Amino acid sequence: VTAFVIMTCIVAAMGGLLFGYDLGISGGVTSMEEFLTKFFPQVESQMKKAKHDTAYCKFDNQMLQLFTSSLYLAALVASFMASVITRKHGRKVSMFIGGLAFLIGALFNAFAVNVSMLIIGRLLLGVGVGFANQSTPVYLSEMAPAKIRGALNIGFQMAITIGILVANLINYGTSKMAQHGWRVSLGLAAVPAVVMVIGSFILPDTPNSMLERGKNEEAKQMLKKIRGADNVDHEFQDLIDAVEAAKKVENPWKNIMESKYRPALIFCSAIPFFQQITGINVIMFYAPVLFKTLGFGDDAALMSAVITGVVNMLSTFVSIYAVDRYGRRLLFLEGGIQMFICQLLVGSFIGARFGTSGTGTLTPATADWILAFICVYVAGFAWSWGPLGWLVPSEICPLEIRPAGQAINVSVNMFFTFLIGQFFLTMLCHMKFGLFYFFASMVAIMTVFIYFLLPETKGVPIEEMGRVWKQHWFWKKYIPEDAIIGG
Ligand SMILES: CCCCCCCC/C=C/CCCCCCCC(=O)OC[C@H](O)CO
Ligand SMILES: CCCCCCCC/C=C/CCCCCCCC(=O)OC[C@H](O)CO
Ligand SMILES: CCCCCCCC/C=C/CCCCCCCC(=O)OC[C@H](O)CO
Ligand SMILES: CCCCCCCC/C=C\CCCCCCCC(=O)OC[C@H](O)CO
Ligand SMILES: CCCCCCCC/C=C\CCCCCCCC(=O)OC[C@H](O)CO
Ligand SMILES: OC[C@H]1O[C@@H](O)[C@H](O)[C@@H](O)[C@@H]1O
Numbered sequence: 179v180t181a182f183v184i185m186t187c188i189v190a191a192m193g194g195l196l197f198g199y200d201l202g203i204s205g206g207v208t209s210m211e212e213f214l215t216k217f218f219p220q221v222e223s224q225m226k227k228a229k230h231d232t233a234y235c236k237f238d239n240q241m242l243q244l245f246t247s248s249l250y251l252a253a254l255v256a257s258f259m260a261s262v263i264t265r266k267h268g269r270k271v272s273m274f275i276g277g278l279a280f281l282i283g284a285l286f287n288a289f290a291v292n293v294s295m296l297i298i299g300r301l302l303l304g305v306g307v308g309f310a311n312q313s314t315p316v317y318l319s320e321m322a323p324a325k326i327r328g329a330l331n332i333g334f335q336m337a338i339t340i341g342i343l344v345a346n347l348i349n350y351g352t353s354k355m356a357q358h359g360w361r362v363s364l365g366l367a368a369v370p371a372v373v374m375v376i377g378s379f380i381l382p383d384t385p386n387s388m389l390e391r392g393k394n395e396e397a398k399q400m401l402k403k404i405r406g407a408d409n410v411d412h413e414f415q416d417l418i419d420a421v422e423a424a425k426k427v428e429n430p431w432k433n434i435m436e437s438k439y440r441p442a443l444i445f446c447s448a449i450p451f452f453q454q455i456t457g458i459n460v461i462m463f464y465a466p467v468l469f470k471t472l473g474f475g476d477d478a479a480l481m482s483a484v485i486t487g488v489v490n491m492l493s494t495f496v497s498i499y500a501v502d503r504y505g506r507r508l509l510f511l512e513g514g515i516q517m518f519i520c521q522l523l524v525g526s527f528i529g530a531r532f533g534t535s536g537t538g539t540l541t542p543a544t545a546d547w548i549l550a551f552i553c554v555y556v557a558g559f560a561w562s563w564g565p566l567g568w569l570v571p572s573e574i575c576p577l578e579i580r581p582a583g584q585a586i587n588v589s590v591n592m593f594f595t596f597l598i599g600q601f602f603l604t605m606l607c608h609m610k611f612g613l614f615y616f617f618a619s620m621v622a623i624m625t626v627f628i629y630f631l632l633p634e635t636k637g638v639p640i641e642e643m644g645r646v647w648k649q650h651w652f653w654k655k656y657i658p659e660d661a662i663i664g665g
Contacts, residue, residue: 179323180406184330187321189377191333193273193314195370196280197307198341200249202487203363205463206349206480208234213360217293218242232467232479235607243600248297249304250596256308257588264313264581265430268383268391269320272313277374280306280367288365299364304592306371311588315572316580320384321404324639328501328569332494335565339491341370346483353480385414386577386640390421413639419663420641424578431582438644438661439579441653445632446571446583450591452624453567456517457617458559459595460602462486465549467607472540482549489553493560505636506566507628513562514625518618520555524548525614532611563624567591573635574643576661639664 207213214222214233221236237246256279260272283302290296314334322330348366352359382400389397397417401410427433434443465486466479475481497509531544568587575583605613633650635643642664648657 179326180404182406183321183323183404186381186404187318187330187333190273190314190317190321190381191330191337192370192377193276193310193374194334194337195341195344196276196303196310196367196374198338198343199345199367199370200303200307200341201338201459202342202345202483203349203367205234205466205483206346206353207360207363208237209476209480210353210360210363212357217290217296230471230473232470232607235467235603238603245297245300246600247596249300249307250592252301252304253306253308253311254304254589254592256305257312257585257592258308260309260312261430261581261585263309264316264584265387266391268387269313269317269581270378270381270383272309273317273381274375274378276306276309276311276313277371277378278306279303279309281371281375284365284368284371288361288368290364303367308588308592310374311568311591312581312585315568315587316584317381317384319569319572319640320386320580323405324637326502327573327640328506328636329498331569331572332498332501332565334568336491336494336498338568339487339494339560339564343484343487343491346480346487350477350480350484385417386420389417390424390577413664416639416641416664420577423576423661427578430579434579434582437656438658439576440656441647442571442575442579442583443586445574446586447590448627449567449571450587451594452620452627453563453591454594454598455617455620455624456559456563457521457598457602457613457620458556458564459599460606460613461521461552461555461617462490463606465545465552468548468609469545471609472545474545485549486553486556490556490560490564493557494565496557497561497565500561501565501569502636505634506570507632507634509562509566510628510632511625513558513566514621514628516558517555517562518621518625520551520558521614521618521621524551524555525611525618527551528611528614570632570635573640574647576644577641 209232211222211225214225221233224236225231225233237243263275264272279302283299283306286295286299286302290299315331318331318334319327349363352362355362385397385401388400398410398414401414402408465482469482470476470479500509528548532539571587572584602613631652633646633653635646638646644657644661644663645665647653648662
């Protein structure tokens, strides 16, 4: 491990900020009266008569769901495009496109003068997210020394949570603007894109992609540079071995369903789905809706998005320290147990305080204990399914289908991000605390799934990952002998 490989992965992980900024900023902007009046005067015309509501709760009308989904549709579709680009031209090439498309969408939003620029900036933001999220995890996983691959991979997620936090702070400040606050909120999304774009000019590409697309001596020089050694023959042989197999495959989507890829295929699909049916993107807004409904500051709701975002970042550090010293399984099991227990605690706490005879017992101290319970649940997510949701699919895919496997990860995730968060929109807004129990069972299901089916992937060089599957009960019947590289 060199100072060069470290700085390279830090600079590449900054692509998480794009997704993170957008996740953090859109809740505040949508509550801004000046922004609603411009683009959705029908929402404003009933926010005017609500006072105790949250505006994004009325994005339940058919045309409003269209506008919301368009970003996830664009990202879902970009991510497949980026599978092809990333393999054909290299990982740093999809990262460039991700930033540049995100930049273009940011200025379109910040300078929108009607609802068609907003759509167009929203389509573009999602293209940015499909490319950034499809290729940055691949880049990190392949560039990092195997010893610390998980730590340097999670920096992508660390960046996502920094994006979430920073956006929430921005919204808090621009919300106290006489005019154009929403333009600042959307417009500052352009700083991370410029950073990502400029960065992509300076990053090297992975020797894995370099060797796979013909640049041989260039691949070994880059391996010797990031590893800092001259005797890279050993792991360069793993690369030679894998490119030998991978260069027999063109159109990885043709062979994706072959038996030797079944483990990676299953997990590239279930891990994104599970990450969302956790309910993280429903539960993260229970407290601000609740706070606003029951009186309490408009500020108070935004203040609790900051507190959660401070907890959501920072918790990330736990996964970063633990993931390579003790593994992925530990974080998956502990994180799920913790998340399971907070969901039962908060579901029943609400169900008690506001349910015996009648309904309606507003309380400050009761509101803070629900936020503490959610924060511990968000912490358990933040060092399990959060980061592990962008680490594990990237590190279980043989070279020829790695980019395609990351695209399955992004597309399934965006599809379910939108689907779960829109389906649960009504219950979240009408304070149906039964959702915490439902999300409890899913966390139970997914924790059991993980326990039995996911082998430990820590410490293994990326191209040797088939030995791990072969040494797992159950999955071992899928992996042919010729798929085990380096031992
Ligand atoms: C109020 C304005 C504030 C503006 C805020 C600007 C945000 C800066 C971006 C940071 C990307 C962070 C991602 C880097 C994650 C690095 C952690 C890591 O990857 O691990 C290191 C490894 O363990 C070593 O041994
Ligand atoms: C490395 C740094 C890169 C720099 C990244 C750029 C920063 C983006 C900020 C954008 C804010 C846009 C503010 C525009 C607000 C003026 C809008 C206006 O005045 O128009 C009113 C409208 O027409 C009424 O109908
Ligand atoms: C080596 C790695 C170091 C590990 C670093 C880990 C840092 C994670 C911190 C988590 C805080 C979770 C506790 C949740 C805080 C509750 C906040 C709250 O309840 O807010 C109420 C507020 O007062 C209403 O107004
Ligand atoms: C080019 C690389 C891949 C690009 C992938 C593109 C695929 C997604 C396309 C459209 C998403 C849906 C867009 C439809 C948006 C309609 C918005 C709207 O109708 O807003 C109404 C407003 O509320 C007034 O009432
Ligand atoms: C990985 C190491 C294993 C560690 C396992 C930890 C699991 C914790 C489970 C439930 C905590 C629920 C209790 C949350 C404590 C919140 C304290 C708090 O601050 O709430 C007080 C409130 O702010 C005043 O009104
Ligand atoms: O930190 C919170 C975020 O973590 C990411 O890993 C997930 O993909 C996001 O949906 C989530 O909102």
